[model samples]
Target: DVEELLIPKVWVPPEDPLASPSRLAKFLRENGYKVLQPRSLPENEEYETDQILPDLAWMRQIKPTLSLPIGDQEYFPKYYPTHRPSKEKPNAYPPDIALLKQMIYLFLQVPEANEGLKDEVTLLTQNIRDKAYGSGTYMGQANRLVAMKEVATGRNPNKDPLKLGYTFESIAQLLDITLPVGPPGEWVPLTRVPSRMLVLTGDVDGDFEVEDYLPKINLKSSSGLPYVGRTKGETIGEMIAISNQFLRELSTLLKQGAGTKGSNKKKLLSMLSDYWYLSCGLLFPKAERYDKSTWLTKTRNIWSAPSPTHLMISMITWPVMSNSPNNVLNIEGCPSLYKFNPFRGGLNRIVEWILAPEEPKALVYADNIYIVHSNTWYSIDLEKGEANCTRQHMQAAMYYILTRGWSDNGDPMFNQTWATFAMNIAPALVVDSSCLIMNLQIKTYGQGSGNAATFINNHLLSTLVLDQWNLMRQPRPDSEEFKSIEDKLGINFKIERSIDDIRGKLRQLVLLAQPGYLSGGVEPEQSSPTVELDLLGWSATYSKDLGIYVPVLDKERLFCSAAYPKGVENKSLKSKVGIEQAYKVVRYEALRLVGGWNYPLLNKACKNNAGAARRHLEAKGFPLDEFLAEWSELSEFGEAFEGFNIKLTVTSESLAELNKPVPPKPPNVNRPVNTGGLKAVSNALKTGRYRNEAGLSGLVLLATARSRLQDAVKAKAEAEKLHKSKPADWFERSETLSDLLEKADIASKVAHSALVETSDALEAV
Candidate 1:
């Protein structure tokens, strides 16, 4: 038998008429409910037709008869209520008596009995309560209410909890409230609630006793906050204090568990991780919320994907080339071969190791290989995948070339060997004889060939076909030429006989020395001379061939003639001079185009530009400009220039200004004299400090005879701009202003003095 229980002597009022079941039914009808009649049973004597039978099922079923009377009301004698007492005097019933009776009825009415049913009911009730009022849930609401109360009271909500003697335990003690126990009468301590207490008390410690209750605090201090202290400190002080207190408490709790043996290391690390996660969300909440939609998020998402080699090539190549040294093997006979090779350094090795470890070959050699593939000979290994090269490999190779010198064929060699290798490569690479000369010109002078070489190679060859023209031009007037002509004509001109005789004598001596000369084979002794002559002739012929129409020496004259022929008299000579001037112009233009004009300024604009240009020009035989420009562009130069200029100017001026001094003024000329003895004595007495009746009497006598010196200078200065006035009369023009300023200064001093004095006085009191 189930027993029902209720609190003793607590009366419950009858249900209000408006809230009763009959009233509710009437209300439902008034709102929207309507009634319908039930259908009759079928002929087979079943309860009803299929559809209507289910509807009138309750009437068809044999319902159980009531074992007890419906009107029997049994009140429990042993139950007690736990609701708070009402403030109203002697109410007829408890405010929640009806709720209490419903609760008792719920307890007594059991469905099918099951194991742990009572425990399950208890747990369900606890879950409901927890949902409504747990520290994690209703704590926030409670804190907001407390904050509102504090605000209404006009008290600082952040007052120290210790000073107020208010803690979680304290609050629970004050309220005399016991929280509901867990199953089997287990109790969980209330320590402190997060966010809630933080919002309410700010710096103050809040009252709560749950073991897990202390709010997670940020221990890392923010910038611009002062060190922790009780008073006269910054905002961080309060944060530091609270954090310290929490850590101390946490440390204590951690000590209580066996899991805490490693707590010092583990707890801190775990807490730090949690703190970091939470802090990141708090500090950069927007970042935390960002997903794939954010641009940064997208970038981060695809960061690990492989980039196209060509794209990588483009990025790396442009920057490297922009600042690359001219010693690159592509520019024939680059002299930077002798300069420091950057690729031979540790950085290039590291790049090589990382990018293409399989290809441990030097970068300069790789560049040579690439050039060979591009130009004369293609490598099957490189092309067919027997040897694969990636952007990383190319980059490493380019870096090596930039830092190390290589031969025309990409062979590594000493600096001195470059000229020979370059010369041999020039003929094959250069198509025209003039081009060969230009290539040689670059080799000899490097970038120093300047506009002369540039004009001759770039503009002159295109303008005049020097190679074709040179072949058609006159040959040198040699002794051999005269001999050949004399023999052909048979009647020798006197000049031709001398040239023939000279040639015969020279030939006879050659024959005497070696029989090969007479036999039409070159003698070993003559071979060296012949070869030297041939080489000299070849070089001279090439120079002469191009020089005839567009001589390097006469470049300015040529340019001038071309630019301004009508104005000059010697047209041919002027043309030559104009060509030379054109050379200068080309050099200047090239410099300007590449922003290398005014090297110092350009160098100062950017370090990379300065360094690159320096290396480029130096490799081209313009090291002087490179050195000067780089040195002058340094920051030290600007500082030194300023300091030197100031020092020199100041030193010179001080030395020059040491001569003159102003004379002192005469004393008696500005003074006034009184001849009468008593008046003089009275004036003297008036000037002296007065202490007695005699001094006062003397001052009174002197007042009648005292001089009114109106002629004394009463200087004044006028105010100029709003806040400014002439310095001369500034002290005299506004006596009241001076008085007021003095008063303000005095007041400020007095206030400060009084503050210090009052503090001392308070301490004494």
Candidate 2:
């Protein structure tokens, strides 16, 4: 029935930046700027640095502290000694504030040390800051060094910076800017010497590029522990292209039938009466001393605006930037956050791809207005079909998150670029629950790639299947396993030797999850948020390694997971089975886990998942996948979540295995639980007449019966466990409970009686 609401096909086209007109493509092609030449008002022109620039009349100090407060003792002594202020003068800026002071300014001095390298004093200055330098301050920023013009050699007779010298080449760069008021262009000029911390020339997907490249967080593999920030792990342009593709699908889904798939009808109609309440505050820049909450509140309304025309997608993204590389604790000239001890935040904003983890495959599309996340397209108007959003009601609910402000504060945030980027880039954000909407028009639009017609066949909603599928991926070893490894391979591994030597002696045992092999692919693609450990799943041991997943080493120093994206790891496998086959295991299991306690979220989600999974499984020498397909076959009782009434691709042969002469429509397995029928039979039992045949008593009871099914299933599982616990010799007759594993009963006799009782109940009323 819900299929009528979903005609748009699954599968998003591959995004090649060079495929269309883009900012980067255009800049590279037209500007001919092979390298980015960072310059400014040459020498004498320091307009901004010399003066207190005029503010944008809207800026003003807010009364309540904008503090996202960190306590005094919170600073670990080994890592941050200076934070304990000793009650000395110069103001007791709490340890939190005092801790901030240590590296805050030295970061400004970092760029200056570059020119002073020839001078010992300059080198010495840098040595001290290494004392305080840390990831906290370094997390979001990006920079690197070039030979300072004053350095002794490597000069071309000609002097143009971008090219003439042939002095240097493409150096990947990103600026981690937040908190401090200065712009990237202004501050980039400050960091230093031969040991400089910028212009990382490694491959694109290295942990080095994590911040700018991987914008979305992986929710599936991640679990939270107090001291841990990211355990399992975890965007972009052409975005205009993605946005367009989404609107096209939304435009189509709203097609057939009247646009009313919305739920909670009664509550929604009541929200219609809250219009005046909605207009109470049209505030943002118009107010003085605007608190961060105001921006959040205003944005929340924009995100959850209620009306028939209201439609939008909501998702939360984390560590999009600003990871734990707390640099303030490590910089020079300030009291060390960890001046003397080895303690400090080691988590880097940019981790090696191997250590960081991979995502499952999901489509990514965006247009000028909004970016659509998830496998299938999302509709913007909640009042109509798939209109899950009741604008006014939505805003009021999201309002609470914005209210949780921090203990420490900053200047009126509305003025900063990053803050503005946060607000303007998307529809709204109350803390991290960002919800952006791009209300569509009635007319149709062109669609994205991999839709039904041009479909490339990729798994749609893999969350359910992949969670279980994760069971198969091999795990990386624990610290104890690798720290004292015998190094028996003995070539004394170094990435510097010939590529062949790098693999010397370690032959035959190569896939051994050694520290040396792994990668974050270059020209890397984003992992599907719904899938886990897609690429990086292979840890040292062949089991699932849980907990804060860090790298075995910054281990992979190559261009990407593939020495180059073409082949990152186990490269020979591509020639052996092809890249597609190497990457299909997650989706392979995703489709097969159907019609059970966990099926695809939507009808089409299932279909897309099935089709892709089927195609991949079949294509990859199907015999290997038979086990997964068998595991995913739907049982008679499947879980239900009406909220996710999306499409599913359930043709009769959707589950037919590889070699059967003629596979029947999936047999034996039951359809989704029938609700009305369940209530009918359930009422029959609650009444006393079931034993006397209240009604349909003559019917074949098991298959059509929905009554007591859960208890039947749960009790059966529980009873079986109890039945199995008897000691080898003490049991009276363990054989009597033979069917216990499959039967939904308390005991062998209880099973038969309950079945008959429930059977009568099924037919009774």
Candidate 3:
């Protein structure tokens, strides 16, 4: 997240400027200016060139041993490097400070640089010291450059240069602050260049026109990884318009139910509390910073959660300006806090839209919410029913507007304006009115004043679900299997491509998990502190390429044995019928596996899986059933899998097929045991049981059962090997297999009995 700038070697004054005049020296003289000689003024004089300047209280000495006194570095620490002193004789000023001092020494050579700005260089030095060069420095400070420009043009400088707001074009034209343009540290002068090391134009006080260099920072994605710093992603005008619509909707709805006897208003407020708690309300802190009034009171105990009224009051009295410390949410787990109404310029604008008698004429508005799309606007009356329009109805309308409700007519002027506002004029900070309606109202008013230069976390949080959803969508490889599925279904059921589909899905998740939207209008049980997304489940893998989570059905799982029913390799099938059946099963299994379901086929929708498996077996005309049946039967005994819950009714057809023997493998003593079989049995013993007398007894019995099960499987394999060899010891091996099987059965029954008793004991308690 940190920006890379090893050293900011900006234009420095040459050792002997008069001997070999640089472009800067000529620039001053060409515009009718006298080039004064560099000289040290009287040391004792108040306006001394070497040190002090009269009527300049802001100026201060930056010692070599100690740090530079307060200014720019304090605001933008990451952009500037740390200054340290080296053991040199003259003085080891930091690179930036050294460059600043050198610039001041050269500027002092000309009386023009000193004309009406004795304190200007000192302020600039202070600005550099605080590291506010690129972003944090205010625009009004550009008056220093204006002063030098006035002297160049043979005109007197303004008496109140600090108060004037100049256009970016004027600033860019006068001060040729060019960036490094030539090869390898070569210097060149241009009429207009963005100041990478200083704020030649910014909106700290007066507004600036340029939107490209608006401050931005990396915000944490849904998965908690830092997403790329974004700018002009969403527009201020759109957000403001969207916010105003929401405000009006809420106001209209509240007005209908605000009578003394109306309990619906109280209910709506409580619902807002729940929504707040579900979204950012829970994420941001709740304690009021200012004193709670005794006469007016602070809160009402209207909802299940504490402090519901504070949220309502804050929304009703939203802050006046974007820079107001009172508007900060200070959301937890976020590095940069988001501020409300970030586009508001000053008191000239509406302070609070809801508090106004009617909609302000400055913003475009209709009788109802209007959405602009594809160069045209559509008016949407979100108020479905005048009397019965509840929060749920309003929420649905809002979601519709977000997804599929808007239309576009493609007018040239409308298209131009929309694109300009969305892509160029707006910073990536605003998206809809969610900030005012959802984020701002939820938290207590911000106290004190520390949130300067902090990027709006809302710019990230608002689109987190959308960003994650988009990343999760990866194009599946074009294989024959996929081709067949698409041909049959007439759609890629696995992939979600429609914007409406994705938006609606994510909205549903938010409503259910956080707001409890459709669950009888009650505040749901709080299960987690953050939103839980089950979109990709555990199938979502971290994509380093995208820096977000992406889900992939890898080659093995898609077309090979990992997903395909085992024992398909040896089976021979005639037509596409058999292949289609197999493909159907594969598709079904793929979805289940992606949902974090690892249970065997028999455990999942037993009838459905069995039907799919049976159809495949019938079409193939092979004994694939027997091969799969063994694992399915074995899985039923797996307690760790929750597979013990399965009680499969093997059909007579399957039963007959399963009775047939598996084809014999070429005899080899070195052939490894199926560790997968051993793992299944071993897995049963690993699950923790209650440590009561009965539970302990059950665990011991289960361990005994596992040992017997392993022995039985080994003995059966040995008996088969002996039979294949046509050995003299085949009969003895058969007897051993029978004995081990009997012992395993008995142990299994005893373990089941002990577990039943343990369950009975717990039930008794």
Best by TM-score: 2
Sequence-dependent TM-score of model 2: 0.16
User: What value of lDDT does candidate 2 attain over all alpha carbons?
Assistant: 0.19
Candidate 3 lowest-lDDT run of ten: 177-186
**Candidate 1, 1-765: lDDT as tens digits:** 975443334322222233233443353345332211111111111121223223222233221121111123422111111111112222311122222233234434546433332332333233222211101111121222222222222221112121222221221111111110011011111122121222222322344332322222222221111111111112222232323333343334233321323234344333332221111100000101111122111110000000111111222222222233222221221111111122112112222222332211111111111111111111111111101111112112222221121211212221211111112111111111110110011000010111111211221111111111112231222325422322221111221111122223222332343212112222211111110111101100011111110001121221222211111112455335333333233222222122121122211222232244445554655434322332212221122122212211111122122111212111110012222322222232223222211111111111111111110011001111112432212223233333433442321232232122212221121
TM-score of 1: 0.12
Residue 301 accuracy (lDDT) in model 1: 8
- Per-candidate TM-scores read 0.12, 0.16, 0.15
User: Candidate 3, overall lDDT?
Assistant: 0.23
Off by over 4 Å in 3: 1-233, 236-241, 259-261, 274-765
- lDDT digits (tens) for residues 37-111 of candidate 3: 221111111122223112222223211121111122211000111111111211222223432343345446655
How high a TM-score does candidate 3 get?
0.15
Name the top lDDT candidate. Answer: 3
Total colliding residue pairs, candidate 2: 80
Candidates in order have lDDT scores of: 0.20, 0.19, 0.23
